[PDB]
Amino acid sequence: LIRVGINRGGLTYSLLRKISNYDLVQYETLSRTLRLIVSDKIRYEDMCSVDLAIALRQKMWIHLSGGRMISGLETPDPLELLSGVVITGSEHCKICY
Amino acid sequence: IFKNIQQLYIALGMNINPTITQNIKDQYFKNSNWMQYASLIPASVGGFNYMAMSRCFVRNIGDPSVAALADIKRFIKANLLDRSVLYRIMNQEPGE
Amino acid sequence: DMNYWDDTDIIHAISICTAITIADTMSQLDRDNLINSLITEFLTLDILVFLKTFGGLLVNQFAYTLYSLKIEGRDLIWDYIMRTLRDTSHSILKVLSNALSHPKVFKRFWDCGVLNPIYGPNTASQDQIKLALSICEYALDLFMREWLNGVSLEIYICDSDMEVANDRKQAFISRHLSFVCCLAEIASFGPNLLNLTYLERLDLLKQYLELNIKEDPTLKYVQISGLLIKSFPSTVTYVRKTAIKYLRIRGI
Amino acid sequence: GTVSDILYPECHLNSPIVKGKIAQLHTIMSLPQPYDMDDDSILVITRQKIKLNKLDKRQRSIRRLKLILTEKVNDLGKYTFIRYPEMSKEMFKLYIPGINSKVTELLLKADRTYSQMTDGLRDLWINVLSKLASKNDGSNYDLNEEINNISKVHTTYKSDKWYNPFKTWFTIKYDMRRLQKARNEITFNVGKDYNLLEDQKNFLLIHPELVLILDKQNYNGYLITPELVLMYCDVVEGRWNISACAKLDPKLQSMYQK
Numbered sequence: 039l040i041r042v043g044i045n046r047g048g049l050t051y052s053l054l055r056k057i058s059n060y061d062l063v064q065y066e067t068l069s070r071t072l073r074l075i076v077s078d079k080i081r082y083e084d085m086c087s088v089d090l091a092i093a094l095r096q097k098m099w100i101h102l103s104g105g106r107m108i109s110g111l112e113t114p115d116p117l118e119l120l121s122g123v124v125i126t127g128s129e130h131c132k133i134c135y
Numbered sequence: 136i137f138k139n140i141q142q143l144y145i146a147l148g149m150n151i152n153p154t155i156t157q158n159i160k161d162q163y164f165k166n167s168n169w170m171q172y173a174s175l176i177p178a179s180v181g182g183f184n185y186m187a188m189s190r191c192f193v194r195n196i197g198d199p200s201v202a203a204l205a206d207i208k209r210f211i212k213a214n215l216l217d218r219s220v221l222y223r224i225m226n227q228e229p230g231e
Numbered sequence: 232d233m234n235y236w237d238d239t240d241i242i243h244a245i246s247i248c249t250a251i252t253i254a255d256t257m258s259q260l261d262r263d264n265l266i267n268s269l270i271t272e273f274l275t276l277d278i279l280v281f282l283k284t285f286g287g288l289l290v291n292q293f294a295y296t297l298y299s300l301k302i303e304g305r306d307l308i309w310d311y312i313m314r315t316l317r318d319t320s321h322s323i324l325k326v327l328s329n330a331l332s333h334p335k336v337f338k339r340f341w342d343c344g345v346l347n348p349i350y351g352p353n354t355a356s357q358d359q360i361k362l363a364l365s366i367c368e369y370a371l372d373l374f375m376r377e378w379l380n381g382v383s384l385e386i387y388i389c390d391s392d393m394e395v396a397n398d399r400k401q402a403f404i405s406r407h408l409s410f411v412c413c414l415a416e417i418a419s420f421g422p423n424l425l426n427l428t429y430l431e432r433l434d435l436l437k438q439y440l441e442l443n444i445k446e447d448p449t450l451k452y453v454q455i456s457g458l459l460i461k462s463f464p465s466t467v468t469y470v471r472k473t474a475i476k477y478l479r480i481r482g483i
Numbered sequence: 484g485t486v487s488d489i490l491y492p493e494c495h496l497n498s499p500i501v502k503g504k505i506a507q508l509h510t511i512m513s514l515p516q517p518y519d520m521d522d523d524s525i526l527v528i529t530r531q532k533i534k535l536n537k538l539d540k541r542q543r544s545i546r547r548l549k550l551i552l553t554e555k556v557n558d559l560g561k562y563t564f565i566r567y568p569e570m571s572k573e574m575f576k577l578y579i580p581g582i583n584s585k586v587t588e589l590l591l592k593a594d595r596t597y598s599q600m601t602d603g604l605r606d607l608w609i610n611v612l613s614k615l616a617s618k619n620d621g622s623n624y625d626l627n628e629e630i631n632n633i634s635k636v637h638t639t640y641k642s643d644k645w646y647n648p649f650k651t652w653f654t655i656k657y658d659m660r661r662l663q664k665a666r667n668e669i670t671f672n673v674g675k676d677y678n679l680l681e682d683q684k685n686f687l688l689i690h691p692e693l694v695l696i697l698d699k700q701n702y703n704g705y706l707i708t709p710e711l712v713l714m715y716c717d718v719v720e721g722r723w724n725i726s727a728c729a730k731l732d733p734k735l736q737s738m739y740q741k
């Protein structure tokens with residue numbers, strides 16, 4: 039990028055500042071998130087991850103979506119959906135029963 | 136997880152990037168459990184953890200957010216994270 | 232007087248006085264309270280301390296506006312300051328542009344690296360406002376980095392009258408406290424400072440900072456007591472002239 | 484030289500290793516020449532450029548380190564320099580305890596932080612395994628060697644044969660990369676561009692163009708290019724990772740010793 043910009047021009051300090059501050063901005067954003075003050079009115083840990091994703095996307099995209107519905111994205115993850123039973127010892131499947 | 140923790144410490148204390156100031160460094164080094172949270176929260180919702188637990192079994196996991204929130208729930212059940220971490224993640228500020 | 236001074240101290244004094252002169256903070260302090268030949272010091276000052284002091288003065292000038300319009304964080308402060316400086320032209324920009332027009336000053340800032348050859352085709356008398364703006368862009372970031380790395384900032388409060396110097400010092404303390412409140416991202420809940428005097432502003436801001444320190448011992452580990460103030464009975468311009476005359480006497 | 488804040492030095496080896504560059508480093512600053520080359524044209528060119536005072540800026544910066552070398556090390560003529568391939572046995576295990584006192588504390592902090600979560604990790608994996616394959620009759624998942632080994636990952640990594648060479652090489656690479664990046668970025672005062680570290684047993688000189696290592700117990704010298712620094716560093720890091728991870732996994736414990 040620097041070589042081609044030297045060859046052609048168009049680069050400026052205020053453009054590469056964004057690249058040079060990237061990691062620091064990431065750390066600052068995480069630190070801003072980590073010291074937030076929250077209440078326990080909503081028990082998010084008792085919800086399904088699909089519902090959590092839907093609620094999070096509704097919250098973070100509010101300045102564009104408003105109250106409208108975003109569809110076609112959420113799918114279940116394998117480790118939460120599945121329940122494996124190893125049948126042995128002449129006993130019926132507990133989930134099937 | 137161990138290598139992620141080591142790399143976070145290296146990037147925050149022994150790297151040639153001059154933009155990393157001192158307030159960020161000691162804020163992460165002195166606030167309790169902050170390095171653990173940074174290394175353990177999934178990257179899709181803010182953290183630096185890039186390995187989903189279901190990735191150890193399948194290559195395609197679907198969309199990253201659902202896997203990240205399922206992993207956060209599993210962490211809460213295993214006492215690796217507190218519920219307040221989930222609440223903060225749910226109530227973080229949006230971008231533009 | 233300055234007989235005990237060494238070369239490094241007099242050079243630092245020259246650079247600090249040049250920074251104080253370029254950005255007319257002294258008249259700003261006076262309104263809070265209700266020289267064409269500039270080449271030789273620019274050829275005989277220290278670039279690093281001058282840029283750091285200039286960034287400090289620039290961010291101190293806009294501190295009250297940054298407090299009134301609730302802006303938090305280094306990135307947003309830099310963005311707003313540069314946007315205001317680019318849109319509404321100042322007189323300090325004109326002074327800096329006139330100073331940088333000289334070929335030797337341009338060569339110095341070119342060899343130091345602030346005037347990057349890549350970022351645009353610029354020579355002596357080619358452009359002035361763009362060069363001043365680039366200098367300001369680098370100075371702001373440099374000062375922010377130094378302040379966050381726990382480096383003290385030192386300025387000179389010079390006036391013939393003692394009480395006037397003390398009042399100027401108090402106004403500067405008030406602006407610096409407001410800037411520290413903005414940089415700590417705790418300025419959203421601050422008390423309103425509209426249509427109010429500087430003494431009560433300082434008292435209220437100090438009380439608010441003390442309360443926040445009481446909440447958490449470190450306010451996100453942001454430095455506070457980095458100000459180092461030296462006061463002289465003579466004026467700033469006289470101090471700069473006196474320092475440069477001793478520098479001439481010692482034969483550089 | 485270009486100046487920008489986005490230009491970083493290389494962190495890993497991406498180019499080949501050329502004998503000509505090392506031989507030229509030997510012949511620029513006047514030292515005995517250990518290499519014999521199939522085509523020594525670069526040596527002839529460098530010697531003629533030396534004779535006619537036609538060295539480049541970087542070449543002159545490399546050349547003027549000989550003055551520092553003669554000033555510091557008094558008995559310089561009785562050291563023997565060793566070629567690249569022959570010195571790999573000593574470079575692969577290089578320990579300088581004096582210089583690696585900065586990475587040690589960071590890694591200790593990392594070990595402490597990891598150690599404060601092994602119980603949670605064990606419980607997490609136990610829950611996942613019990614939910615994914617539940618057997619009605621016993622099959623207690625706790626007494627699994629793979630799960631039990633979670634609580635000793637940091638201990639196995641730390642108590643490893645390749646830990647100290649890795650620390651030393653990482654420190655060396657960090658210093659050299661810091662100098663190389665210091666070339667590109669904005670600077671206000673010009674000073675020494677090298678880094679000298681003196682020990683009772685080792686002598687280490689780091690320059691953006693070279694690394695010189697002298698051991699005085701047996702009077703041997705090693706002059707290496709920045710490419711060799713990255714090569715040695717990531718080779719030793721790979722050996723460290725392989726050894727630790729093979730030690731942890733029960734299926735590879737034989738491959739550890741092998």
Ligand SMILES: [Zn+2]
Binds near residue numbers: 134
């Ligand atoms: Zn069944």
